[PDB]
Amino acid sequence: TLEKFVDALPIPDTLKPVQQSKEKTYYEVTMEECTHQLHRDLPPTRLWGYNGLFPGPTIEVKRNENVYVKWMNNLPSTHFLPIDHTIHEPEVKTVVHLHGGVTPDDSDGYPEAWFSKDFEQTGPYFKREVYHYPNQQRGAILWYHDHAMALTRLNVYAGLVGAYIIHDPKEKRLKLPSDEYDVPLLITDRTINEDGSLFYPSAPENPSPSLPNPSIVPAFCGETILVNGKVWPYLEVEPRKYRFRVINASNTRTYNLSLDNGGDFIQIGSDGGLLPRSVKLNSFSLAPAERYDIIIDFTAYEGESIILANSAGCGGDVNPETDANIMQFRVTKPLAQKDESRKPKYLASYPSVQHERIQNIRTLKLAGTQDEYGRPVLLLNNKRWHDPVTETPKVGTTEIWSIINPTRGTHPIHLHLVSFRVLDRRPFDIARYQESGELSYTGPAVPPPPSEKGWKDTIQAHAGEVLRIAATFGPYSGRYVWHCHILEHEDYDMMRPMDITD
Numbered sequence: 001t002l003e004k005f006v007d008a009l010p011i012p013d014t015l016k017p018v019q020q021s022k023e024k025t026y027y028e029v030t031m032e033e034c035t036h037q038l039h040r041d042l043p044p045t046r047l048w049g050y051n052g053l054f055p056g057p058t059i060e061v062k063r064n065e066n067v068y069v070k071w072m073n074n075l076p077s078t079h080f081l082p083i084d085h086t087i088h089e090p091e092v093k094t095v096v097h098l099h100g101g102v103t104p105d106d107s108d109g110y111p112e113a114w115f116s117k118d119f120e121q122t123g124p125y126f127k128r129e130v131y132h133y134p135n136q137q138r139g140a141i142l143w144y145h146d147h148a149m150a151l152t153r154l155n156v157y158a159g160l161v162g163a164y165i166i167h168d169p170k171e172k173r174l175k176l177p178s179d180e181y182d183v184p185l186l187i188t189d190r191t192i193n194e195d196g197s198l199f200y201p202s203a204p205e206n207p208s209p210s211l212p213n214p215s216i217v218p219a220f221c222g223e224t225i226l227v228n229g230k231v232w233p234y235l236e237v238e239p240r241k242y243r244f245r246v247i248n249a250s251n252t253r254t255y256n257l258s259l260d261n262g263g264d265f266i267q268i269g270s271d272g273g274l275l276p277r278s279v280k281l282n283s284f285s286l287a288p289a290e291r292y293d294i295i296i297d298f299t300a301y302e303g304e305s306i307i308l309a310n311s312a313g314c315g316g317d318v319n320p321e322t323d324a325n326i327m328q329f330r331v332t333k334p335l336a337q338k339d340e341s342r343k344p345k346y347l348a349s350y351p352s353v354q355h356e357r358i359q360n361i362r363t364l365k366l367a368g369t370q371d372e373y374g375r376p377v378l379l380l381n382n383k384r385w386h387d388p389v390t391e392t393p394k395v396g397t398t399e400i401w402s403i404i405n406p407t408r409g410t411h412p413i414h415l416h417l418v419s420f421r422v423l424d425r426r427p428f429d430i431a432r433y434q435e436s437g438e439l440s441y442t443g444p445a446v447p448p449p450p451s452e453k454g455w456k457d458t459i460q461a462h463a464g465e466v467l468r469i470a471a472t473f474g475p476y477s478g479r480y481v482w483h484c485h486i487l488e489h490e491d492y493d494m495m496r497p498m499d500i501t502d
């Protein structure tokens with residue numbers, strides 16, 4: 001296996017606007033096939049990258065900054081990963097979703113608003129080439145990635161992911177670590193062939209001859225872990241406080257992170273922004289598309305090498321020599337200045353200060369069926385993506401969504417547009433629910449832990465539990481989506497339209 005910790009962690013450069021004035025900032029980002037070396041001992045890997053970079057450039061904006069991004073497809077007309085034509089026109093379709101963005105619907109990256117190279121062909125919901133992000137929302141770590149219908153798992157795996165940070169100047173007074181000391185960590189698992197090329201399965205193992213070829217698989221677990229486009233990298237840090245924006249940009253894999261010197265993380269933020277109170281943690285779970293905004297204090301660890309370790313399995317127990325490792329910090333960089341940063345306990349208002357009336361309660365089941373080839377098709381409420389819309393909240397109203405998961409694993413559920421509150425999780429009798437549809441609880445409700453007392457947009461719905469969240473659907477109306485963020489599930493067919501009506 002590749003030798004761990006021999007390449008430095010790349011820090012993606014911050015994108016510079018093509019045009020900028022007090023009234024508007026305009027960016028251009030072009031999707032290109034490109035080659036980059038992913039590890040010291042591999043030949044360069046062919047990838048698809050935003051501005052030909054993997055990951056894409058980090059975009060940084062202010063709260064309320066009037067931003068435009070023209071996302072362009074300059075990719076080849078043929079894909080390089082295995083396309084399964086039986087699950088759903090040009091072969092290569094792309095569209096960019098700013099994950100976490102409070103965004104007008106035609107700029108949200110709807111799966112059917114895709115475009116081919118140079119916008120030659122566009123999907124039925126395409127309206128515009130240049131996307132608009134008003135950023136009228138809390139400071140937070142967002143990220144952007146491909147969202148095209150039936151191809152998201154392939155386009156994202158090819159390398160189409162990047163970070164986007166909204167800075168709210170009202171938070172500057174908190175003195176959180178900043179600038180060179182505020183570093184995004186985009187984690188992506190991959191399997192790489194000897195010749196350096198990416199490997200993505202063209203079918204399940206044990207391929208019944210009843211399967212199409214290629215065939216979609218229900219989950220992808222990569223053999224190697226990359227951070228910011230390098231396999232098991234190291235980062236040299238100064239012995240002081242750093243802020244890390246940790247993003248899970250993997251197709252399926254969930255991580256459970258810790259530090260091998262027993263140090264703590266101080267969580268300061270979740271998907272939707274700063275938590276009301278900082279939270280000291282020895283470990284945390286991070287499923288696909290979730291973000292943790294954390295401080296690590298290396299002050300007392302000068303000279304040490306500390307591994308950011310992983311204990312979550314993917315298709316099996318973790319292997320101590322490979323996927324149990326994410327990256328290595330080396331506390332060997334001399335201090336450039338006094339550490340004037342802080343790790344305050346009091347960070348922001350509690351979401352619970354809000355007292356919205358509950359307009360509606362929706363009950364949603366995570367289910368599925370089996371196709372003519374014997375494969376599982378995962379479905380939200382047993383509806384297909386193409387079935388008539390059923391999730392139709394009224395603009396400005398607040399709803400409780402009750403997500404029932406009778407399946408064997410966790411599904412990370414993402415709602416577009418909004419961030420929401422976690423109310424509680426409660427275990428139920430699976431067999432009974434499956435036989436009769438009756439929901440019978442086997443224990444009391446459990447309120448969220450501190451890490452989930454703030455705002456979330458992608459939320460783990462564990463097996464054998466009902467998860468309740470509360471969301472206010474606004475400020476925009478229109479057609480969005482909600483879906484599982486295991487990409488292999490999303491593309492077949494665990495995604496539904498969401499109409500916020502006026």
Ligand SMILES: [Cu+2]
Pocket residue numbers: 378410411412484485486489490494
């Ligand atoms: Cu799922």
